[PDB]
A = this chain, B = another copy of it.
Amino acid sequence: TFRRLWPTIAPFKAGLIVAGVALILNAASDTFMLSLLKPLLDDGFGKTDRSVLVWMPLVVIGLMILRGITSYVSSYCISWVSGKVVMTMRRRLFGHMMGMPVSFFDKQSTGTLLSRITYDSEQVASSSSGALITVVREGASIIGLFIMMFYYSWQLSIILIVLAPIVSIAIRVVSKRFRNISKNMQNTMGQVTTSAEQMLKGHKEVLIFGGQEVETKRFDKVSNRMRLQGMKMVSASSISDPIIQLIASLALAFVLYAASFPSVMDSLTAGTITVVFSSMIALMRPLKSLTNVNAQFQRGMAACQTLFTILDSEQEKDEGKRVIERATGDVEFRNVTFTYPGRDVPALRNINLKIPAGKTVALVGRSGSGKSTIASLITRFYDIDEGEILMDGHDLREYTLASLRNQVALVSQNVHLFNDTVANNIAYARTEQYSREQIEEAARMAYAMDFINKMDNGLDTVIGENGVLLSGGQRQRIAIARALLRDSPILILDEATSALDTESERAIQAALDELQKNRTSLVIAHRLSTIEKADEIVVVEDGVIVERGTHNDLLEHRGVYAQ
């Protein structure tokens, strides 16, 4: 997976290499601080000299200011590659998510989409850089310390080379056994954890049936099991490191025994042995991290693989041919066979529904099925499987999706509002073309200045981020204002307000009449007024046309005509 991530990080190598050289110097400023111990004792408290000891406090600041300056440079210029290999791939994920079919947001992935761009994005540069802060730094501390051992005491360095790899495999095997036991139990605590959710959801039945005592008893039992596995998990966790320390001490003791087993040893000065022993203690942490540097790296790269799954999914079907400036004619349906993806029940049978030019087709307000779904096919939110839809007396498959949707203009109370200025919001992707000269008149005839004027900055104000939070009816009104860039052939109004707010419902009715003077329409009709104002109501229910005819026919065949 790192193979595929490499092109994404490749142009941002300049920060990486500076991180890969400012960390080696961070490994050669911890193995060179220790070397000064040999001058400090052999030449400072052995051969008694002040000249050899007065520059020591100087060089134990220069090395440490180097440690600080290289640590900052590493943590920054590796944060810079962890700011241009997480930001660029965030931008790629967002640019691909916007194009992906809306069916994906229909419970293929519904709430994790933030975590799939924020946290799961961060764990490709907060725990893959942690495998290049450690492979280089702690993997160079080992090399530096071994170079020190060779330069000072080959006699004990050979012994370390014999032993330390054995300590490493010991560390790995005990860590692996602990990890197996830990992740074996993780499913167990998850299973006993969801049990409490199962009780908490049914607070209702728990209250109604005779008592909670039988429920409290079971909760007590599962809590006791929770604890008696949690303590076992901790015992497995906190015993791994003591055994590691003990086996590492076996090396520290075997070297000390080998420091006197022959007469060849014990000829080493105090400085050399103090340096050697200090180095052995400073070899523990890098050995432990170099073995652990396959956990972090593979965690990060598996999370990146899952991000790649999100990124690699099929784009929206972009095979349309004809660019429509205006579908001057009318929309027609023809034998459309559509099913909700992920389901088996067909959503719509063969439909041949005629919507005429310059008029409106209403729909049965409460069909119970296939009411809002039929509005989907004009906007190609979910593409049709078989059967065609005739834009302007021309098939929809022939039309580019952007071109298709430029024509359509949806309105509903559930309309999600953009968050830039009102001037941009009304003319989103059209601000340079449709200037405020149009937007002033649009807000005039929108009947929405009761909140745009009252906002006191309505001509230019941020409309989202919950900045103003116009109510849902006002969202419908400003949706009409959005459509008041006009020339939109199809006008889908969900009309699901169910609330005749004072003059606002009459306002949207008047604006609908204005948008019906020149443009077509296709409305879901719950309100009786629109049903009367409808021109040809092709009522459809249960995936099949049940009745066709204008208001007089619907009065003749009431069906569900009420109130």
Contacts and interface: CB of A to CB of B under 8 A. Distances in A.
Contact of A72 (B99, B202, B239): B239
Contacts of A254: 57
Contacts of A197: 113-114
Contacts of A71: 238, 241-242, 245
Given A57-B257, A72-B239, A273-B41, A410 B227 contact: no
Contact of A37 (B210, B274, B415, B424): B274
Contacts of A245: 64, 67-68, 71
Interface in A183-223: 193-216, 218-220, 223
Interface stretch (A1-9, A47-55, A155-163, A340-348): A47-55
A44 B118 CA distance: 58
A87 to B, nearest CB: 4
Contacts of A80: 231
A194 B465 CA distance: 9
B410 A274 contact: no
Contacts of A235: 72, 75-76, 79
A238 B75 contact: yes
Nearest to A210: B429
A83 to B, nearest CB: 4
A457 B220 CA distance: 27
Most chain B CB within 10 A, of A218, A227, A239, A269, is at: A227
Interface stretch (A353-361, A401-409, A538-546): A401-409
B57 A253 contact: yes
A201 B111 CA distance: 9
B428 A209 contact: yes
A83 B231 contact: yes
Given A41-B273, A266-B48, A76 B209 contact: no
A60 B207 contact: no
B76 A231 contact: yes
Given A99-B212, A205-B417, A211-B428, 11 more contacts: A40-B273, A41-B273, A53-B260, A64-B245, A68-B243, A72-B235, A76-B235, A83-B227, A90-B223, A202-B418, A207-B381
27 contacts: A53-B260, A61-B250, A61-B253, A72-B235, A79-B230, A83-B230, A83-B231, A86-B230, A87-B223, A90-B226, A91-B216, A91-B223, A94-B200, A95-B216, A97-B200, A102-B207, A114-B200, A118-B193, A204-B416, A207-B381, A209-B406, A210-B405, A210-B429, A210-B486, A212-B402, A218-B420, A560-B562
Interface of A: 37, 40-41, 44-46, 48-50, 53-54, 56-58, 60-61, 64-65, 67-69, 71-72, 75-76, 79-80, 82-84, 86-87, 90-91, 94-95, 97-99, 102, 105, 113-114, 117-118, 193-216, 218-220, 223-224, 226-228, 230-231, 234-235, 237-239, 241-243, 245-246, 249-250, 252-254, 256-257, 259-260, 265-266, 268-271, 273-274, 277-278, 379, 381, 402, 405-406, 408-410, 415-420, 424, 428-431, 464-465, 482, 486, 560, 562-563
